[PDB]
Automatic annotation (TrEMBL), chains A, B, C, D:
Mg(2+) binds at D44, E47, D48. The chain holds residues 28 to 368 of 404 of the full protein. Its EC number is 2.5.1.21. One of its GO terms (biological process) is lipid biosynthetic process. It comes from Trypanosoma cruzi (strain CL Brener). It is an enzyme of class 2 (transferase). This is Squalene synthase. Its main location: membrane.
Length: 341, 341, 341, 341
């Protein structure tokens, strides 16, 4: 019992936000998801440490998942804060892993490698085009979408058919990662070395240097560039709706809907707002609470996404460049929503 | 009309959950059970209220049922909040009561009296032996099983052969009560004054002072006594199944299954759980939602009780000495379960 | 009464359907047919445990029919569900046995033995050819035909000049059994350990791996392999009609016509259907409701059979590999039905 | 001492291909390689036997490596020829295993267990994609390349850095295992039941039924497919050239180079050759004698490899489909060789 407790204790300590949503699931579902998260967290931890040689990463990450069967493996000099204790006591994670159904072990191990390999691809090349941006997000978010979906099936809580086409599942992950990449633009831009995710194929149409946006000036394009990033994100919404409306199990739904609705609300805020280049754009605790409270069933869930979407569209002028691309990205979204009510 | 609307309004107020389950019954049977619950409720409001003297209770309780024919009666000095209001306006209960079929009225009175007496017995003495434990749960729960079963037969929805041996009916109520007694340990002991139900004949083998389970120091002995308790409740599982399998009506079944399935799920969570000693362990709103949805038919019900049963035996370790008492009990439970598939 | 009650409350607990058809019969024969069924199922239960030794079967099976007196018998560690209860409390079957007339008693014994050995012959061996097929079905199903036919005779209800030739009596059994083997495939293929009854001589022509059928990428050949199975079945049809036509007792006809009609209906549904490889295919409640209702006399029976035989021919087209063939088999069937109108 | 005798004895009886290259190793390292082989050999005998329930393999194969410490362990009746005698007296192995550098023991156990679970993972599922193919070859061959590589470093004969990247080592195993699968096509497709490894993602393009590759009628699409397989295998060559060129110890190089060269020689003979679909194409013993004699030095090895890679290419012609892909892969392997000269 000491193993699973260490997992949940470090989970809540390294990702309190997500640590709350995950408590929507129960029994073995939450157990697997918890371990699944920690593994990917450990993986990303190593891949994020810049004091680690590139080669070491290029040959260790690809076989990271192999340590999932070695109940003796662990690290000692890596990890930021509590992220350290996770790698130093990984034994608890792997030992808990070996208790999950053989079905859960595979999805986790499989995704861990696929993601790890995807990370190695970007450890040697920059993110220039949108394809790169969509592929990168697919590795750190999209695949996460695949894994979870494969879990709802292996659990028997959802219809086996939910895993034929994972396009939407991938969309579920992209909507979150992108909404995040946008908001967390300032924190990521100043860090040394600077971690950039915004594709040159999008910001180059606005500036020569990206780290020139902090400056209160150029603020006119910063917005236009930001909106371009938002629009690019509003593309996944329609698919997000489709994926949610395909969920039947109440537990699996709340765990899948809460993050999405939370993202749409986040976008409706960061959209067409300069304050994104200087500080953290967060939703009010009241909005956070309610979302976590009503996103238990489709209807009410679609009912909120529908609201935030309008509060996103109803914030720009026909003078703002994207009044068109958005006016459609909004209808396309609302449509999908209206087609399930 | 208005009396009924009060009873149903006070119901969801004093006990939401049950107020949702009771909706599984038809207006006919529902009106009776709702009043049956409020009677036993107002009765408990007197027993559990330590703010008043014992000579007041042993004076009022014994003749509580008699008040059912006095639509004027009411008590205005016992209980807290809602429950307190239930007594000050007990009139509505008796009102609607007089509007019930004689058959129902009598069953509600017989149980109210027999329970009232039982409460008095344990009102001037504690629970030391297991027999005490069982006998008590009988007076406050087992009898409810008898009453309900009698109401089912009386109504005609269930066959008369059901009331031949109220043994399994008693088991139904015991499984629920024991599960609650096991979960609300910390809450009941942090009561002023402390409320204890765990039979001395049991904790006596793990500590001389039950209050030691609150301190982590005795975490081992605590969880070791907790598992002993859970083991005591598993004895009723095989019987609960039999009773649920003897029900023919779809409405009565659901109303009888849901609670049982909710208890098993809860029992699988608090099993070998130490959190039980510092907080209240509960199922996820989503899981309790999945239970209300499928506890409509026997089979679907049996596989849920099965799953949760297997979950209980899984969270078990071979290292500790309770693994044996249980392994044997889980089999008798799963056996009886498969014994109907 | 205490013994038959058990025999009935148990019969009604494993084959709800047959437990409804058996009531078409008369008290004298019903009680007999009932015990006759139980004994056989009690037998199949022994012949169908995969967590039980082989040298236990024969050593115990061929002494099965012998143990049908010795009212002091019973097996405590056999099957699952109610079945094991039938064996752990087999006693009620042996006294209700003698309690019952003996003209039948001998028939039960005769087959009970024959069938048991037929099962022994196949325990270690398996089905490689259609010869193994028709043979196996003979022991488990065909013989039930001989039996029932015999019981019919000895009861004076049917002509003694009917137990002379038993060919058709075997066809009734094979048809019923073979139809179940086709419909209950996925259910059997998923048995753990696996259960196979399909002639190696047949699927060796549409594939090289039977378990493969679970696939969705072998369909085309899987269905035509199914068509072949159905084709093989339709060979008994003409002989089924003939038998039903000979029966002259209203009560004995219904009990012998419904199962057949139910089979033809099911067979006319599984034919050229892929759904058979991922779920059980069964007649709608309304369809089966009409079957029990009309299959009381010959004419009505022959008409439904025909109707269903004309729905199995409506699913195929010229492009089919068994098309021009089945039209032949479908004819031989109708011809027979049409020669009694 | 007497036990290593049994080990080498059995070794020379079971494996006639590797037995020679192993015997030529340096005593110390050799014993571990001998036992390492005998271990995997015992494991395989289990997976490759069709008289065992696959329901008990999945439950015990993953435990097989545990017996490596229990000198009293052995298996009663499984496997034929000498392989049977292998487990019956598996003690000689385990006791010889005991007296080996703990490092060697850890490597054998690790690979053994990992390979075992890989077999179970492929006992239920089959090879449909080119992923299942590479993954399967990985479990039963790539891992062997891992173990040996680990054993090399463990002995100190090779630099500790040889274990850094095990990707090339994996390529080593795949080149051998694949060449055999391609060469043993006929021998395998004519089994009871049949054995197949050629990925559907490849042959589904050249036929509807793989078995159709035995008829002179489908001789055209048979070869065209065989070429697809050869190309797939020719992908691992470049890495093979790299791994060999990384070995510094003569003993290790000879043992590693010979098998690789032999495979390429065999591949150059089966390529575009159609006798494969009915006979077992092989290298003349005089050729495998020339290879053993010269594959002791890098340059000599690279040379032989090149000339075998060249004639494999000088086999196809313009009118051949694979012509283009072969050139690329061939010249790709060539360049790798000329790179180390
Ligand atoms: C129904 O579809 C569900 C789609 C979920 O989409 C995604 C997308 C990205 C993430 C994430 C994340 C992290 O911030 C946490 N750790 C894993 C990747 C990164 C960095 C370390 C996550 C969070 C996540 C991570 C691991 C397990 C579950 C969920 N989910
Ligand atoms: C088919 O068998 C049915 C067995 C039902 O078993 C149980 C067991 C315990 C309870 C309860 C309860 C209470 O908390 C609510 N009130 C009545 C007894 C106590 C205190 C006041 C109850 C809830 C209950 C009580 C009265 C009426 C309906 C349901 N049922
Ligand atoms: C007028 O001709 C009548 C032909 C009846 O043909 C058949 C064929 C098969 C069966 C059957 C069956 C079982 O599923 C039930 N038990 C007996 C054999 C198997 C397994 C255990 C049965 C059902 C059966 C079994 C026992 C007694 C009566 C009928 N009948
Ligand atoms: C320097 O890199 C060396 C790469 C060697 O590549 C490979 C690839 C495949 C095999 C093999 C094999 C087997 O047929 C024999 N047994 C082990 C795996 C299978 C089945 C049972 C083997 C043969 C083998 C197996 C065990 C010990 C030594 C060699 N080696």
């Amino acid at each position: 019992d000491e193993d699973l407790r260490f997992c949940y204790d470090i989970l809540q300590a390294v990702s309190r936000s997500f640590a709350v949503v995950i408590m929507e699931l129960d029994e073995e579902m939450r157990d697997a998801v918890c371990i699944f998260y920690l593994v990917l967290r450990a993986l990303d931890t190593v891949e994020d440490d810049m004091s680690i040689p590139v080669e070491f990463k290029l040959r260790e990450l690809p076989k990271f998942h192999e340590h999932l069967h070695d109940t003796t493996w662990c690290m000692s000099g890596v990890g930021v804060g509590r992220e350290r204790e996770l790698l130093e006591r990984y034994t608890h994670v792997t030992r808990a892993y070996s208790r999950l159904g053989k079905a859960y072990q595979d999805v986790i191990s499989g995704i861990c490698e696929r993601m790890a390999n995807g990370m190695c691809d970007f450890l040697t090349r920059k993110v220039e085009t949108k394809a790169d941006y969509d592929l990168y997000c697919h590795y750190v978010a999209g695949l996460v979408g695949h894994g979870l979906t494969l879990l709802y099936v292996s659990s028997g809580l959802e219809d086996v058919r939910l895993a034929d086409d994972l396009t939407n599942a991938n969309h579920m992950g992209l909507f979150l990662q992108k909404t995040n990449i946008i908001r967390d633009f300032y924190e990521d831009i100043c860090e040394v070395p600077p971690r950039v995710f915004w594709p040159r194929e999008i910001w180059e149409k606005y500036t020569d240097d990206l780290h020139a946006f902090k400056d209160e000036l150029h603020e006119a394009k910063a917005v236009e560039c930001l909106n371009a990033m938002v629009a690019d994100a509003l593309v996944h919404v329609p698919h997000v709706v489709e994926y949610l409306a395909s969920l039947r199990d109440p537990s699996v739904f709340a765990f899948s809907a809460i993050p999405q609705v939370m993202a749409m609300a986040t976008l409706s805020l960061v959209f067409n707002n300069k304050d994104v280049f200087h500080t953290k754009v967060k939703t009010t605790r009241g909005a956070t609470a309610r979302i976590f409270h009503y996103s238990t069933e489709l209807q009410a869930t679609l009912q909120m996404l529908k609201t935030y979407t309008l509060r996103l569209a109803a914030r720009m002028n026909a003078q703002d460049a994207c009044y068109d691309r958005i006016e459609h990205l909004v209808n396309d979204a609302i449509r999908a929503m209206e087609s399930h009510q």
